[PDB]
């Protein structure tokens, strides 16, 4: 047999909303933390990211070296908003990082926190819409020697 088209079985995300959605970039370059040497041309990543994103109809907004507490203000805010009129939401992060953590201006933190501001139960305007997080964190410690082809 064959089941009807439930449309909950929509093959694709609906991306034709009144507008794309918010896109918050977190650019870290300087740190209060010791031994953390500043990030070189982490800005030029930012420009490009901004560029391509805005060309993608996004509502782009950026935050320079944020103390962790600020990040959370920023997210908590963004999260509590009516996304019902937008296709989705994207956040990006640029800084150092180690295995399992990411650095803010003042401290490291596992991203599992920010992650949880957007779950459907905590943010239904996005329930069923895609949430995208991109990271450029030096996260990790081992090197990859690769293989010649």
């Amino acid at each position: 047999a064959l089941g009807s088209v439930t449309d909950r079985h929509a093959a694709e995300y609906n991306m034709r909303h009144k507008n794309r959605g918010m896109a918050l970039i977190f650019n870290h370059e300087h740190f209060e933390v010791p031994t953390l040497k500043s990030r070189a041309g982490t800005n030029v990543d930012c420009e490009n990211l901004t560029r391509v994103l805005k060309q993608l109809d996004f509502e782009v907004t950026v935050y320079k070296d944020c103390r962790y507490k600020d990040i959370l203000r920023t997210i908590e805010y963004a999260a509590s908003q009516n996304h019902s009129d937008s296709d989705c939401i994207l956040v990006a992060i640029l800084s150092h990082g180690e295995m399992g953590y990411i650095y803010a201006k003042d401290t490291q933190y596992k991203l599992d926190n920010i992650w949880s501001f957007f779950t459907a139960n905590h943010c239904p305007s996005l329930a069923g819409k895609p949430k995208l997080f991109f990271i450029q964190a030096c996260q990790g410690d081992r090197l990859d020697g690769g293989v010649t082809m």
Partner: protein, 100 residues
């Protein structure tokens, strides 16, 4: 209305697809949508059509609706024209687990 097996059968009036068991099909929560061979389950809202000459009503119901309360044997408002009939026809028993 439809919660009664009796009412689920009386909807299969003018039921095409001769070969298929009109009776027992309606018996398992299915009822005619009166449009081609689309039948819908009143206990999970599923709707199924285009049947091959061997598609069995239960297993095919199960295939498209793995949770159907009636089918997994939850207690529901079902008014069984023959409760003993159901008790044998229905799938065995499906426990769900996640560790132990």
């Amino acid at each position: 209305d439809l919660n009664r097996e009796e009412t689920r059968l009386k909807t299969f009036t003018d039921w095409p697809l001769d070969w298929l068991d009109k009776r027992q099909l309606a018996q398992t929560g299915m009822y005619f949508t009166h449009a081609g061979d689309k039948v819908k389950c009143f206990f999970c809202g599923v709707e199924i059509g285009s049947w091959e000459q061997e598609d069995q009503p239960v297993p095919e119901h199960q295939r498209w609706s793995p949770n159907c309360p009636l089918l997994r044997r939850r207690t529901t408002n079902n008014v069984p024209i023959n409760a003993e009939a159901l008790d044998r026809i229905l799938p065995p028993i499906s426990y769900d687990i996640c560790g132990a």
